[PDB]
């Protein structure tokens, strides 16, 4: 008696998943990079490690980061010596920080995205929360549902321990949720807090030390939906196609283990080298079907894992220096905020395009690409289309 | 020049997401429930706790579980005294077990599902892995991609620290992935291992003790896709509609925290009571639109969190005793395997329906319901349609 074909046709949306609002937030403590080597070696009681401090100074000087926002403060660190050591039992203390800070910071970003969107929060049907900092049950998705007062029947997707490519993963996921469900409006929150990874320096663990020069905190929230209501809602970017892949010859490039001493990162190959060697293949898969092969003719968003990734990609492809402007501005002002970075870069790009009177939200260009990079080595690709004005 | 409307129409699938294969697996160590109180009190050095042992005997006797399969053995437990205590630093040891066992066990289930499906594993486009036992980077999704030799470009969804309602969550997710992507074939793996939650008894923590009578290990894998190729592929169940909700007045009903001493569960309200009081609302939301209100006229799959949940639901609704047969058979033979349970119950149901010459894979009935229950208190609902034969 019941027709599933009829239900299916009635249940799905029609157009491309569209980003309709972006909002960001960061902890209030702004940490300058210029003075960080002195601060970090003094807070971790490592001033005697002279040669290691000089190496860290060089890491910070080459980082291309001017400042980062950190939940961790001098006061908090002085109350937690076990977090200040390279390797001490400290997960309970770290989890106590981040189980609360992840949803708190995510809430600030989400409220800003919901205000921009302008529609009732009761119309949010799906919620995706993503973090690499801590885990809990119920998760940060339940906490944000409670904090924001979303309907109890919001459909939740809790993405935990994902890693830095997951700004692309949440987009890939939101595209299918929005496109397959008529009326669906997805709240997407990436919220990343370095309290789980902060640790003291060790001269036999320089891969861990690199992270201390680069990682910073932040959250970004999106509203994603298909079939925007013309003039009530305001499209910013459309998603058209997505991929995820594991680069060949990259086993153990970025491993991260959550242990009694918190989250520790290793580094076993050449990440900038692997990303650079495999980005062309990713671009031809995405853009050959669209007939485009000039990679300066599209707008760019790349996870700024470190500046060398960006430099080697630019060099490999002969990108004009300006292509990575929005990416590098986020790296400069906020550091590497793991999954949230790429979403901050979308906000910077559309704000600067709008501010400067360009024709589209993608720097005046029609088609664009967003890349996430992280453990695996994983590359996430999202093909975007800009919107006029 | 490029039409996004044309790309979108060409990119999506047409019909309902369909389960095309189910495969399960469990650790080889079969632990009888009849003798478990003696074993568990002797392995945790708690034989002097006489009154507590009698309470545990009553829990085991009322469990309605005959046996469970456990990765943990007497030999492993004797090498890990910190896991045998109620609360000792032991996460590193537990993680070392489950980071390997989750993907190992998931691989066994997946190979069985892929064999049933009968198609090249190179046609798997999306992979969903779900577990509440341990976390790692790259995750168990990357490990299973490697172990099974899936294409490196499989699109992965790593669902960590989800909890027991997540057999419904992975179905909810796979439905959108399969339906919005033409040709997509999703491998779904739930793999749950009690090494993260096993711990010794404490008389002031009886909620933790209940879990020791009920939790068991197992993995289940599905192949999900839309537009099955007639006669090459073989539909088992179709998904039609899904929901997720948080029951009112259930704050802290099931909390689980991942700490230096592993994963510990609390229990603050009446779970059977909350589920029973809110299941009718869930059923009217799902089935009022389909015109059905006789809940004995549909086939049933319910997460067997414990037998009291099932009994109170049966009593509340006046379900005939037979409705929960497949659910109770899985609880009896495997215990509560968290997210995997509901997938084992689907396999038991379709196997017994086929074995006994019924007309559909849903016990001869057309429409069915699958429920997941877990932290929040969360209720996941999946409306299913059976297939003839």
| CA geometry: angle A242, A244, A250, nearest 5 deg | 155
| Nearest residue of chain A to residue B11 (CA atoms) | A241
Buried b (16+ CB within 10 A) or exposed e, A260-295: bbbbbbebeeebbbbbbbbbeebbeebbeebebeeb
B33 CB-side CA count, 13 A: 24
Is residue B78 within 8 A of residue B166, CB to CB? The reply is no
Sign of CA dihedral A238, A189, B167, B104: positive
Strand duo B218-225 + B18-25: pairing: antiparallel
Closest CA to A106 of A141, A156, A132: A141
> Which residues touch A149 (CB under 8 Å, ≥6 apart)?
A121
Placement of tokens 């979308």 in the chain? A346
Placement of tokens 């970075």 in the chain? A341
Which H helix or E strand runs over A302? strand A299-302
For the residues of B145-207, what is the DSSP string, one character each?
HHHHT--TT-EEEEEES--TTHHHHHHHHHHHHHHHSTT-EEEEEEEE-GGGT-----TT-HH
Task: Name the residue among B8, B160, B256 with its Cβ closest to that of A161.
Answer: B160
Instruction: Note if the bond before A377 is cis, omega within 30 degrees.
Output: yes
In a mutational test of the B interface, the residue from A10, A87, A135 whose CB has the highest number of chain B CBs within 10 Å is: A135
User: Measured between alpha carbons, how far is A185 from A121 in angstroms, rounded to an integer?
Assistant: 10
> Which residues touch A58 (CB under 8 Å, ≥6 apart)?
none
Q: Is A256 within 8 Å of B137 when comparing Cβ atoms?
A: yes
B76 CB-side CA count, 13 A: 14
Q: Is A2 within 8 Å of B179 when comparing Cβ atoms?
A: no
User: Measured between alpha carbons, how far is B58 from B70 in angstroms, rounded to an integer?
Assistant: 21
DSSP character for B379?
E
Placement of tokens 């603050």 in the chain? B268
Measured CA distances, A165 to A273, A373, A380 (Å): 17, 4, 6
Min CA distance, B3 vs chain A (Å)? Answer: 10
User: Measured between alpha carbons, how far is B291 from B310 in angstroms, rounded to an integer?
Assistant: 25
Measured CA distances, B47 to A328, B54, B206 (Å): 63, 11, 16
End-to-end Cα, chain A, rounded Å: 49
The most distant pair of C-alpha atoms in chain A lies apart, rounded to whole Å, by: 79
> Taking the CB of residue B251, how many other CB atoms lie within 10 A of it?
15
Report the SS3 class of residue B19.
Answer: strand
How many contacts (CB atoms, under 8 Å) link A and B? 172
> Which residues touch A63 (CB under 8 Å, ≥6 apart)?
A33, A213, A214, A306, A307, A335
Measured CA distances, B255 to B252, B265, B271, B337, B375 (Å): 6, 6, 12, 17, 6
Report the Cα B249 to chain-centroid distance in Å. Answer: 24
What the block records as the tokens of B135 is 């976390």
Measured CA distances, A42 to A84, A205, B15, B94 (Å): 10, 18, 62, 34
Q: Is A161 within 8 Å of B158 when comparing Cβ atoms?
A: yes
Which H helix or E strand runs over B102? helix B91-117
For the residues of B49-94, what is the DSSP string, one character each?
-HHHHHHHHHHHHHS---EEE-S--HHHHHH-HHHHSSS-S-HHHH
Placement of tokens 């006229």 in the chain? B297
Buried b (16+ CB within 10 A) or exposed e, B135-150: bbbbbbbbbbbbbbeb
DSSP character for B233?
B
The most distant pair of C-alpha atoms in chain B lies apart, rounded to whole Å, by: 79
User: Measured between alpha carbons, how far is A19 from B130 in angstroms, rounded to an integer?
Assistant: 28
User: Measured between alpha carbons, how far is A70 from B337 in angstroms, rounded to an integer?
Assistant: 39
Q: Is B142 within 8 Å of A375 when comparing Cβ atoms?
A: yes
Length of chain B in terms of residues written: 389
> Taking the CB of residue B382, how many other CB atoms lie within 10 A of it?
27
Instruction: Note if the bond before A138 is cis, omega within 30 degrees.
Output: yes
For the residues of B337-364, what is the DSSP string, one character each?
-GGGHHHHHHHHHHHHHHHTT-SBTTTT
User: Measured between alpha carbons, how far is B28 from A144 in angstroms, rounded to an integer?
Assistant: 40
Is residue B224 within 8 A of residue B70, CB to CB? The reply is no
> Taking the CB of residue A357, how many other CB atoms lie within 10 A of it?
8
DSSP character for B237?
E
Measured CA distances, B134 to A88, B97, B130, B162 (Å): 20, 9, 11, 11
User: Measured between alpha carbons, how far is A370 from A19 in angstroms, rounded to an integer?
Assistant: 13
User: Measured between alpha carbons, how far is A264 from A262 in angstroms, rounded to an integer?
Assistant: 6
Is residue A228 within 8 A of residue A257, CB to CB? The reply is no
Q: Partners of A24 in the beta sheet?
A: A220
| CA geometry: angle A273, A276, A277, nearest 5 deg | 85
Q: Is A152 within 8 Å of B2 when comparing Cβ atoms?
A: no
Report the Cα B188 to chain-centroid distance in Å. Answer: 11
Length of chain A in terms of residues written: 389
User: Measured between alpha carbons, how far is A175 from A242 in angstroms, rounded to an integer?
Assistant: 9
Min CA distance, A182 vs chain B (Å)? Answer: 12
User: Measured between alpha carbons, how far is A388 from A79 in angstroms, rounded to an integer?
Assistant: 51
Placement of tokens 């040669």 in the chain? A51
Task: Name the residue among A159, A238, A244 with its Cβ closest to that of B153.
Answer: A244
Min CA distance, A273 vs chain B (Å)? Answer: 19
In a mutational test of the B interface, the residue from A1, A3, A5, A8 whose CB has the highest number of chain B CBs within 10 Å is: A8
Measured CA distances, A66 to A336, A338, A372, B129, B355 (Å): 11, 17, 22, 39, 68
User: Measured between alpha carbons, how far is A361 from A363 in angstroms, rounded to an integer?
Assistant: 6
Which H helix or E strand runs over B245? strand B237-246
Is residue B256 within 8 A of residue B166, CB to CB? The reply is no
Measured CA distances, B42 to B76, B78, B82, B338, B385 (Å): 14, 11, 15, 26, 47
What the block records as the tokens of B384 is 């299913």
Helices vs strands, H then E, count in chain B: 13, 13
Report the Cα B167 to chain-centroid distance in Å. Answer: 4
> Which residues touch B224 (CB under 8 Å, ≥6 apart)?
B17, B18, B19, B20, B171, B174, B175, B177, B178, B185, B186, B188, B239
Q: Is A243 within 8 Å of B7 when comparing Cβ atoms?
A: no
> Which residues touch A322 (CB under 8 Å, ≥6 apart)?
none
Give ranges for CATH 3.40.47.10 in chain B.
2-235, 236-388
Measured CA distances, B178 to A17, B60, B65 (Å): 16, 41, 35
HEC sequence for A202-213: CCCCHHHHHHHH
User: Measured between alpha carbons, how far is B34 from B32 in angstroms, rounded to an integer?
Assistant: 6
User: Measured between alpha carbons, how far is A212 from A337 in angstroms, rounded to an integer?
Assistant: 12
Placement of tokens 């292509």 in the chain? A323
Is residue B379 within 8 A of residue B373, CB to CB? The reply is yes
Is residue A144 within 8 A of residue A110, CB to CB? The reply is yes
What the block records as the tokens of A73 is 């403060």
The burial of A51, by beta-carbon neighbours within 10 Å (0-12 exposed, 13-18 middle, 19 or more buried), is given as exposed
Is residue A202 within 8 A of residue A375, CB to CB? The reply is no
DSSP character for A340?
G
Q: Partners of B385 in the beta sheet?
A: B238, B367
DSSP character for B381?
E
Domain A2-235, what fold?
Peroxisomal Thiolase; Chain A, domain 1 (3.40.47)
Sign of CA dihedral B245, B251, B252, B256: positive
Measured CA distances, A85 to A51, A195, B88, B89 (Å): 18, 13, 21, 18
User: Measured between alpha carbons, how far is A240 from A327 in angstroms, rounded to an integer?
Assistant: 21
HEC sequence for A355-381: HCCCCECCCCCCEEEEEEEECCCEEEE
Placement of tokens 């926002």 in the chain? A69
Is residue A242 within 8 A of residue A166, CB to CB? The reply is no
A57 CB-side CA count, 13 A: 10
For the residues of A152-168, what is the DSSP string, one character each?
TT-EEEEEES--TTHHH
For the residues of A246-286, what is the DSSP string, one character each?
E-TT-TTSS-EEEETTEEEE---S-HHHHHHHHHHHHHHHH
CATH of domain A236-388: 3.40.47.10
> Which residues touch A387 (CB under 8 Å, ≥6 apart)?
A235, A236, A237, A238, A360, A361
A104 CB-side CA count, 13 A: 12
What the block records as the tokens of A332 is 């400069």
Is residue A309 within 8 A of residue A253, CB to CB? The reply is no
Strand duo B185-192 + B126-131: pairing: parallel
User: Measured between alpha carbons, how far is A297 from A326 in angstroms, rounded to an integer?
Assistant: 16
Placement of tokens 């291309």 in the chain? A64
Q: Is B176 within 8 Å of A172 when comparing Cβ atoms?
A: no
Strand duo A67-69 + A256-259: pairing: unpaired
Report the SS3 class of residue B261.
Answer: coil
What the block records as the tokens of B117 is 């499906």
User: Measured between alpha carbons, how far is A132 from A265 in angstroms, rounded to an integer?
Assistant: 12
User: Measured between alpha carbons, how far is B141 from B164 in angstroms, rounded to an integer?
Assistant: 19
What the block records as the tokens of A276 is 């650079």
Measured CA distances, A213 to A65, A164, A252, A331 (Å): 9, 16, 21, 12
What the block records as the tokens of B192 is 């749950």
**What are the φ and ψ backbone dihedral angles of A70, each rounded to 5 degrees?**
-130, 135
Closest CA to A382 of A342, A331, A344, A340: A342
Q: Is A241 within 8 Å of B7 when comparing Cβ atoms?
A: yes
Q: Partners of B32 in the beta sheet?
A: B67
Helix ranges (DSSP H) in chain A: 4-11, 36-43, 50-62, 74-79, 81-84, 91-117, 140-148, 166-180, 206-214, 271-287, 307-317, 325-334, 341-355
End-to-end Cα, chain B, rounded Å: 49
Strand duo A126-131 + A185-192: pairing: parallel
Resolution of the PDB structure in angstroms = 1.7
Min CA distance, A122 vs chain B (Å)? Answer: 14
DSSP character for A215?
B
Sign of CA dihedral A268, A269, A270, A274: negative
Report the SS3 class of residue A25.
Answer: strand
């Amino acid at each position: 008696m019941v027709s599933v074909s009829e239900i299916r046709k009635a249940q799905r949306a029609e157009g491309p998943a569209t980003i309709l609002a972006i909002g960001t937030a960061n902890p209030a403590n702004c940490v300058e990079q210029s003075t960080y080597p002195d601060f970090y070696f003094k807070i971790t009681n490592s001033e005697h490690k002279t040669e290691l401090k000089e190496k860290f100074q060089r890491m910070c000087d080459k980082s291309m980061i001017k400042r980062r926002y950190m939940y961790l403060t001098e006061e908090i660190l002085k109350e937690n010596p076990n977090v200040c050591e390279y390797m001490a039992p400290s997960l309970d203390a770290r989890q106590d920080m981040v189980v609360v800070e992840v949803p708190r910071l995510g809430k600030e970003a989400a409220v800003k995205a919901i205000k921009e969107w302008g529609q009732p929060k009761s119309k949010i049907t799906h919620l995706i929360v993503c973090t690499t900092s801590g885990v809990d049950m119920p998760g940060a998705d339940y906490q944000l549902t409670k904090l924001l007062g979303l309907r109890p029947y919001v459909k939740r997707y809790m993405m935990y321990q994902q890693g830095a490519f997951a700004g692309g993963t949440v987009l890939r996921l939101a595209k299918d949720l929005a496109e397959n469900n008529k009326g669906a409006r997805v709240l997407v929150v990436c919220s990343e807090v370095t309290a789980v990874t902060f640790r003291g320096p060790s001269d036999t663990h320089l891969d861990s030390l690199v992270g201390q020069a680069l990682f910073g905190d932040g959250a970004a929230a999106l509203i994603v939906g298909s079939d925007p209501v013309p003039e009530i809602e305001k499209p910013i970017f459309e998603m058209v196609w997505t991929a995820q892949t594991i680069a060949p010859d990259s086993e153990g490039a970025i491993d991260g283990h959550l242990r009694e001493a918190g989250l520790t990162f290793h580094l076993l190959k050449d990440v900038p080298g692997i990303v650079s060697k495999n980005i062309t293949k990713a671009l031809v898969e995405a853009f050959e079907p669209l007939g485009i092969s000039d990679y300066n003719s599209i707008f760019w968003i790349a996870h700024p894992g470190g500046p060398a990734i960006l430099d080697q990609v630019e060099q490999k492809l002969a990108l004009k220096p300006e292509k990575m402007n929005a990416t590098r501005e986020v790296l400069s002002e906020y550091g590497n905020m793991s999954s949230a970075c790429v979403l901050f870069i979308l906000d910077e790009m559309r704000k600067k395009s709008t501010q400067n009177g360009l024709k589209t939200t993608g720097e005046g260009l029609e088609w664009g690409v967003l890349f996430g990079f992280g453990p695996g080595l994983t590359i996430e690709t999202v093909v975007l289309r800009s919107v006029a004005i």
